């Protein structure tokens with residue numbers, strides 16, 4: 154084995170750079186190193202609240218990314234356009250790191266490595282795809298079994314259970330993968346109190362956070378997805394007012410331009426998988442926020458080349 158090795162059993166910046174190059178060249182991280190990243194990140198994530206609360210000082214910035222879906226070569230492109238993660242270049246990845254794309258192992262181990270390296274400045278939120286039922290169908294379980302073992306997949310599944318469900322910046326911007334709720338009156342403290350170390354329920358707040366979508370018309374509708382609901386601008390307005398928030402950032406839907414701003418400014422969608430599944434032809438985006446100005450600034454980007462592996466190859 155001539156690949157990346159941890160230093161004294163821990164992730165370092167040189168390890169991360171080595172890992173990204175190793176993965177770019179389509180090589181596999183040693184199972185023992187992969188194992189170590191997973192057990193260590195499980196410990197880090199298990200200490201976090203279900204609602205991560207982050208302060209951004211006046212001069213501080215953060216980058217919010219949406220779905221990446223195993224598009225490892227596009228993930229590297231994000232880091233090239235926007236710089237590597239660091240204490241002065243923080244990131245939030247808003248779920249759906251795996252499935253669909255066929256470099257999910259590479260995406261997720263890279264993200265977990267950066268979580269270990271910069272735990273206070275690199276944030277991962279759970280998506281609907283960081284769950285067993287979805288992984289079984291949409292490629293990740295198959296990919297892990299092909300590259301490693303069923304045992305390794307079990308460990309991934311356990312780590313995903315500890316991913317936080319939402320993040321609030323400066324008490325003003327709430328970020329979650331899916332969206333708001335099937336019932337009125339859900340509070341930030343309700344989110345904090347969700348016992349999240351589980352596969353999501355078929356209904357209720359944990360489900361909604363991972364699964365819901367905005368709709369343009371007032372009210373709520375039964376979701377076309379078969380789970381959770383669609384929520385109108387009245388739902389968002391009420392939730393924001395009750396919780397003293399300005400707006401929400403969510404992901405979970407492909408958008409041709411990589412982003413959308415719905416509900417009169419109140420519900421932003423960011424999607425970070427360009428040319429999704431090598432078919433959709435969409436742009437992707439990420440968002441910059443600054444402590445001095447929490448209004449979203451969108452940065453669009455397009456797909457870059459990847460190796461000759463089809464989406465869903467491992468499903």
Ligand SMILES: C[C@]1(C(=O)O)[C@@H]2CC[C@@H](O2)[C@@]1(C)C(=O)O
Nearest residue numbers: 220249281282404405406407429
């Ligand atoms: C189809 C998608 C997925 O399966 O994750 C994929 C394409 C849009 C968005 O990401 C999606 C609808 C989602 O549920 O997150």
Ligand SMILES: [Mn+2]
Nearest residue numbers: 220249405406
């Ligand atoms: Mn998705």
Ligand SMILES: [Mn+2]
Nearest residue numbers: 249280281405
């Ligand atoms: Mn999703």
